[PDB]
Design a protein around this motif. Sequence first.
Motif, PDB file in Angstrom:
ATOM      1  N   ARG A  56      43.551  30.266  29.647  1.00 23.16           N
ATOM      2  CA  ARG A  56      43.320  30.806  30.982  1.00 23.16           C
ATOM      3  C   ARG A  56      42.650  32.174  30.905  1.00 23.16           C
ATOM      4  O   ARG A  56      42.964  33.075  31.683  1.00 23.16           O
ATOM      5  CB  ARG A  56      44.640  30.914  31.746  1.00 23.16           C
ATOM      6  CG  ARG A  56      45.206  29.571  32.177  1.00 23.16           C
ATOM      7  CD  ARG A  56      44.297  28.879  33.181  1.00 23.16           C
ATOM      8  NE  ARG A  56      44.911  27.677  33.739  1.00 23.16           N
ATOM      9  CZ  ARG A  56      45.080  26.552  33.053  1.00 23.16           C
ATOM     10  NH1 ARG A  56      44.683  26.476  31.789  1.00 23.16           N
ATOM     11  NH2 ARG A  56      45.647  25.501  33.629  1.00 23.16           N
ATOM     12  N   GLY A  57      41.724  32.323  29.963  1.00 28.52           N
ATOM     13  CA  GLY A  57      41.025  33.585  29.803  1.00 28.52           C
ATOM     14  C   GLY A  57      40.243  33.976  31.042  1.00 28.52           C
ATOM     15  O   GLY A  57      39.902  33.125  31.865  1.00 28.52           O
ATOM     16  N   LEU A  58      39.959  35.266  31.177  1.00 23.02           N
ATOM     17  CA  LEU A  58      39.214  35.770  32.326  1.00 23.02           C
ATOM     18  C   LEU A  58      37.713  35.588  32.123  1.00 23.02           C
ATOM     19  O   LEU A  58      36.954  36.557  32.124  1.00 23.02           O
ATOM     20  CB  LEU A  58      39.533  37.247  32.558  1.00 23.02           C
ATOM     21  CG  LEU A  58      39.470  37.728  34.009  1.00 23.02           C
ATOM     22  CD1 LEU A  58      38.143  37.338  34.642  1.00 23.02           C
ATOM     23  CD2 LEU A  58      40.633  37.160  34.809  1.00 23.02           C
ATOM     24  N   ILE A  77      37.899  34.847  41.375  1.00 22.14           N
ATOM     25  CA  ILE A  77      38.660  35.951  41.948  1.00 22.14           C
ATOM     26  C   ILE A  77      37.742  37.095  42.363  1.00 22.14           C
ATOM     27  O   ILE A  77      37.617  37.404  43.547  1.00 22.14           O
ATOM     28  CB  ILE A  77      39.710  36.485  40.954  1.00 22.14           C
ATOM     29  CG1 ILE A  77      40.563  35.336  40.413  1.00 22.14           C
ATOM     30  CG2 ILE A  77      40.587  37.533  41.624  1.00 22.14           C
ATOM     31  CD1 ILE A  77      41.527  35.760  39.326  1.00 22.14           C
ATOM     32  N   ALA A  78      37.099  37.717  41.380  1.00 24.65           N
ATOM     33  CA  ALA A  78      36.188  38.824  41.645  1.00 24.65           C
ATOM     34  C   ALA A  78      35.490  39.277  40.367  1.00 24.65           C
ATOM     35  O   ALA A  78      36.137  39.736  39.424  1.00 24.65           O
ATOM     36  CB  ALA A  78      36.939  39.985  42.279  1.00 24.65           C
ATOM     37  N   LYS A 113      38.867  42.279  35.879  1.00 23.26           N
ATOM     38  CA  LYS A 113      39.667  42.217  34.660  1.00 23.26           C
ATOM     39  C   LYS A 113      40.977  42.977  34.831  1.00 23.26           C
ATOM     40  O   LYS A 113      41.988  42.640  34.215  1.00 23.26           O
ATOM     41  CB  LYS A 113      38.881  42.793  33.480  1.00 23.26           C
ATOM     42  CG  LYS A 113      38.514  44.257  33.650  1.00 23.26           C
ATOM     43  CD  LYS A 113      37.512  44.706  32.600  1.00 23.26           C
ATOM     44  CE  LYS A 113      36.103  44.244  32.940  1.00 23.26           C
ATOM     45  NZ  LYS A 113      35.375  45.243  33.770  1.00 23.26           N
ATOM     46  N   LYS A 114      40.954  44.005  35.674  1.00 26.42           N
ATOM     47  CA  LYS A 114      42.141  44.812  35.930  1.00 26.42           C
ATOM     48  C   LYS A 114      43.098  44.090  36.872  1.00 26.42           C
ATOM     49  O   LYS A 114      42.924  42.906  37.162  1.00 26.42           O
ATOM     50  CB  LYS A 114      41.745  46.164  36.526  1.00 26.42           C
ATOM     51  CG  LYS A 114      40.601  46.840  35.792  1.00 26.42           C
ATOM     52  CD  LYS A 114      40.629  48.348  35.982  1.00 26.42           C
ATOM     53  CE  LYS A 114      40.480  48.728  37.447  1.00 26.42           C
ATOM     54  NZ  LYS A 114      39.157  48.318  37.996  1.00 26.42           N
TER      55      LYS A 114
END
Length: 18
Positions: A1-3, A10-11, A15-16
Amino acid sequence: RGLRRLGRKIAHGVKKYG
């Protein structure tokens, strides 16, 4: 489920905590 694919769902650059 890496970003790597969720970032766009999401956006780009959320990452934050977002």
